């Protein structure tokens, strides 16, 4: 029977305490415990409340020690003893967390299989230095033409996804996973992401719909979902990014590569907000803590590419920031903008308009040079960046209802054709090798020679066409990732031959 084995296990357990200093609870409730005693306490320890709860400690006072409880709070009370565990907080890290949904303590909340721990790590593990680093130079793929060509994202860096509440936020992440599935299977080990997705402040239900979507597309073999849902405690929510991260650091150390998506850093500030006002520590700008910025800063800097004398892997970070109206001059969005080297602004309008998930081609910068994407795709998109910048300016003049220079209207017509090409439906990957034709063709006025309506159909036919007739041209772009006089000429020549079918 199930009961007997369980009773037998319970039975062989003996309590007997022994500790550096006990203490008796004295105030508790509001999610946050406070104990009387405990004057020998070290910072960040875990102290086991006798109710069955465990809580880490962030305030130590010679009066009242401030132990933020995890989970339950409705069986914790005053009269009880708390006993120091004698361990600073640590999480199992290993290749047993693949395909499992895991919380912030690293126990599976799904039960798809047991945790194989090849080590344990600490939630706070200090960010990499100046000496270990090696320069960034390795492409990361969403299968979206705008992301790759305009705001390219490398491995060992951080680039910021900013936008409105649930406007394709899931889509961004999935797009990245899906086109990098092809590479996961592939032959290079240094091209394979073991992606880790972090979900703070979202309901169980969204995650459970997501996993389903990930299992249909067979990308759940290598995906990890670290989660601290709405229901589960305010400390576990602050705690979720820091423990998702140690698991990412382990891939980087081993020579494997991963990308850690951190959703939402805004909701971590809200959790930490709860803690701080209930330990009565003065907040900073806009009611969010006066040391929040340090929290995001130590974390984001754990995506790093190291030298081959250490890891040949790289952790990549994708922060996610959700606005509570739109505003980016707010302390928590401000703080994050500082840290990253890019902005991937998602506009409200453009999402409806056809680019989904939408990338704004106005305000958005990528500080990194363009060797952080494959060499072919840069050349073809060489003047793509100017073309979008001119289309906006020209367009604005264009809107009043005044008529102007025929030269102005060439730029106006050209831009329209690039945007329509850029539009792409959410949840579709599309390898780089087959993004190279389409942007050369647009820049080279091959997609301006045909009408606006038939642009998606022409794109689809054009690629089908290349697999049958010029499959050499594509093999090279996939294998070497560049273009030369012979290949360019072929590409220009090949497009003209099949320019409208």
């Amino acid at each position: 029977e199930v009961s007997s084995i369980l009773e037998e296990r319970i039975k062989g357990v003996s309590d007997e305490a022994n500790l550096n200093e006990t203490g008796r609870v004295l105030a508790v409730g509001d999610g946050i415990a406070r104990v009387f005693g405990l004057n020998n306490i070290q910072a960040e320890e875990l102290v086991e409340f006798s109710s069955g709860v465990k809580g880490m400690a962030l305030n130590l006072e010679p009066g009242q020690v401030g132990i933020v409880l995890f989970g339950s709070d409705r069986l914790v009370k005053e009269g009880e003893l708390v006993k120091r565990t004698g361990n600073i907080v640590d999480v199992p890290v290993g290749p047993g967390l693949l395909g499992r949904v895991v919380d912030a303590l690293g126990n599976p909340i799904d039960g798809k299989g047991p945790i194989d721990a090849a080590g344990r790590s600490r939630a706070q593990v200090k960010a990499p230095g100046i000496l270990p680093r090696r320069s960034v130079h390795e492409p990361v793929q969403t299968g979206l033409k705008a992301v790759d060509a305009l705001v390219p994202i490398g491995r060992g860096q951080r680039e910021l996804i900013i936008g409105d509440r649930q406007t394709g936020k899931t889509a961004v992440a999935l797009d990245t996973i899906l086109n990098q599935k092809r590479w996961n299977n592939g032959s290079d080990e240094s091209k394979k992401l073991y992606c880790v997705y972090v979900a703070v402040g979202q309901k169980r239900s969204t995650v459970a719909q997501l996993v389903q979507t990930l299992e249909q597309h067979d990308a759940m073999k290598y995906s990890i979902i670290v989660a601290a849902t709405a229901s589960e405690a305010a400390p576990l929510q602050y705690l979720a990014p820091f423990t998702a991260a140690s698991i990412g650091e382990w891939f980087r150390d081993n020579g494997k590569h991963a990308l850690i998506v951190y959703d939402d850093l805004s909701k971590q500030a809200v959790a930490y907000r709860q803690l701080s006002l209930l330990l009565r520590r003065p907040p900073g700008r806009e009611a969010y803590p006066g040391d929040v910025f340090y929290l995001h800063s130590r974390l984001l800097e754990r995506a790093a590419k190291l030298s081959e004398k250490e890891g040949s892997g790289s952790l990549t970070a994708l922060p996610v920031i959700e606005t509570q109206g739109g505003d980016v001059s707010a302390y928590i969005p401000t703080n994050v903008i500082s840290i990253t080297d890019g902005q991937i602004f998602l506009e409200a309008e453009l999402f409806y308009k056809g680019i989904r998930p939408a990338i704004n081609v106005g305000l958005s910068v990528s500080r990194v040079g363009s060797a952080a994407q494959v060499k072919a795709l840069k050349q073809v998109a060489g003047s793509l960046k100017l073309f979008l910048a001119q289309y906006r300016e020209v367009a604005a003049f264009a809107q009043f209802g005044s008529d102007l220079d025929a030269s102005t209207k060439q730029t106006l017509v050209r831009g329209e054709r690039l945007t329509q090409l850029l539009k792409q439906n959410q949840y579709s990957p599309l390898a780089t090798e087959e993004q190279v034709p389409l942007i050369y063709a647009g820049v080279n006025g091959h997609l301006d020679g045909i009408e606006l309506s038939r642009i998606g159909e022409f794109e689809s036919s054009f690629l089908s066409y290349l697999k049958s007739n010029h499959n050499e041209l594509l093999t090279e772009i996939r294998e070497k990732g560049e273009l030369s006089k012979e290949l360019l000429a072929s590409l220009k020549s090949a497009t003209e031959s099949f320019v409208a079918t």
């Binding site: 039960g111 309901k203 239900s205 969204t206 459970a208 209930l278 009565r280 209802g401 439906n425």
Partner: protein, 469 residues
């Protein structure tokens, strides 16, 4: 256990007890204060040390004297669930408001509970059809899904919900729960009267609806745990009968505002605006107790009063995370005389991503959004200048979008009297046909009053002849 006490303080509606014996209740227990006014029910929320609790008071607070008996229930109060809770109205305790005498029950269960885990979550995308044209186009509803609406003050928010009760509660579930949290006396009376008229309650029998009602008048603490009582009746249906349920709320806003009231005194230093820090967690639990398990399935429709026409405020904002569809309604758009008041460029769904409910359907809904948005971008232009100072092509586009705006006005068949136009029901299959036509310019000639207050395309056509008269 029976733990007696005396009342050390009575500060506001956050009374404090000092338990005289060494026995001491846990957090989230219920206590009864005895007075010549009848019972007062309080809930333990903090322990402040040396056997002194601080209690949220869930019943009124007048006539109380310091040094008066307390009694410990031994746990959170128990509302009543069963099949014999159907056709009843129940308070915060399980008291009749409908006054058909005490409530027969089998199992009476406590108001608070722990949320079912992620492994117990099993969430479907199976659809549900309504019969409203606008719903079908912009963001479908589903069975297993949690749907949200962000209604006006109290001038069109109810009417919408009443139409919804007639379609969804008679085409799905064996049970339905209405929980109305801090609603007005006039609203509750209208709904009970209406239910019994439409035969959804048979008092002599066993009904398919149960009701939880709690006035907006009642003190802050009491309004919060109206929400809890209702949630318990839904938990009995989801778990113990194991059948599909439903849940309807109009409004859940009363929950958030209640929590912000009790928050300041207790010790929790408020976050900016005035709202509580504990908002995400307090709300969170509730929204993971309203969910669809591998047992029953709680399809929910939740209506949220927007505060001062800002959905940026902490309370509406954190509600949007716990919704896989929303159909946000602007207050303004209600005042304009346009009902239904749902904004069309501010609706979204995870139950229609890009081909999920039929590819043909998604493509038709996509084009409608692009057209409508074009017109909003040119609103500035049309107003500042003329409209005859633009090109003939932009004018077509504008005129089409202006048609789509007016078309969206569809009269209701529950509140049909009030509107002044006899109601309409438009299937999903009809919805697709009607918009198909409109995008292709098969009805870009007939008047732009023909579109207002009509359902389907065919009715616009007919209406042209009535207008012509």
């Amino acid at each position: 256990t029976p733990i007696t006490g005396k009342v050390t303080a009575v500060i506001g509606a956050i009374v404090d007890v000092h338990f005289e014996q060494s026995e001491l209740p846990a957090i989230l227990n219920a206590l009864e204060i005895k007075t010549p006014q009848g019972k007062l029910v309080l809930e333990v929320a903090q322990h402040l040390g040396e056997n002194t609790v601080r209690t949220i008071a869930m019943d009124g607070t007048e006539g109380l004297v310091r040094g008066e008996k307390v009694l410990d229930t031994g746990g959170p109060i128990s509302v009543p669930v069963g099949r014999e809770t159907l056709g009843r109205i129940i308070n915060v305790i399980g008291e009749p408001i409908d006054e058909r005498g005490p409530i027969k029950s089998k199992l009476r269960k406590p108001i608070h509970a722990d949320p079912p885990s992620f492994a117990e979550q099993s969430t479907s995308a199976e659809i549900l059809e309504t019969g409203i044209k606008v719903v079908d186009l912009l963001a479908p509803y589903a069975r297993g899904g949690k749907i949200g609406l962000f209604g006006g003050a109290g001038v069109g928010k109810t009417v919408f919900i009443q139409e919804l009760i007639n379609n969804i509660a008679k085409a799905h579930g064996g049970f339905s729960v209405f929980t109305g949290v801090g609603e007005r006396t006039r609203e509750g009376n209208d709904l009970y009267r209406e239910m019994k008229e439409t035969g959804v309650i048979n008092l002599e029998g066993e009904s398919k609806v149960a009701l939880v009602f709690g006035q907006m008048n009642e003190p802050p603490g009491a309004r919060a745990r109206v929400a809890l009582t209702g949630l318990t009746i839904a938990e009995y249906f989801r778990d113990e009968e194991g059948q599909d349920v439903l849940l309807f709320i109009d409004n859940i806003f009363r929950f958030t505002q209640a929590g912000s009231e009790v928050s300041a005194l207790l010790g929790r230093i408020p976050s900016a605006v005035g709202y509580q820090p504990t908002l995400a967690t307090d709300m969170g639990l509730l929204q993971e107790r309203i969910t669809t398990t591998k047992k029953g399935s709680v399809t929910s429709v939740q209506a949220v009063y927007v505060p001062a026409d800002d959905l940026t405020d902490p309370a509406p904002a954190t509600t949007f995370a716990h919704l896989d569809a929303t159909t946000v309604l602007s207050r303004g758009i209600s005042e304009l005389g346009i009902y239904p008041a749902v904004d069309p460029l501010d609706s979204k769904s995870r139950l229609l991503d890009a081909a999920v409910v039929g590819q043909e359907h998604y493509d038709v809904a996509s084009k409608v959004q692009e057209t409508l948005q074009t017109y909003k971008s040119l609103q500035d232009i049309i107003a500042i200048l003329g409209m005859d100072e633009l090109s003939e092509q932009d004018k077509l586009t504008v005129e089409r979008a202006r048609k789509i705006q007016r078309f969206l006005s569809q009269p209701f068949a529950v509140a049909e009297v009030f509107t002044g136009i006899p109601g309409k029901l438009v299937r999903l299959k009809d919805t697709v046909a009607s918009f198909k036509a409109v995008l292709e310019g098969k009805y870009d000639n007939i008047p732009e009053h023909a579109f207002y207050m009509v359902g389907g395309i065919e009715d616009v056509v007919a209406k042209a002849e009535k207008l012509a008269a």
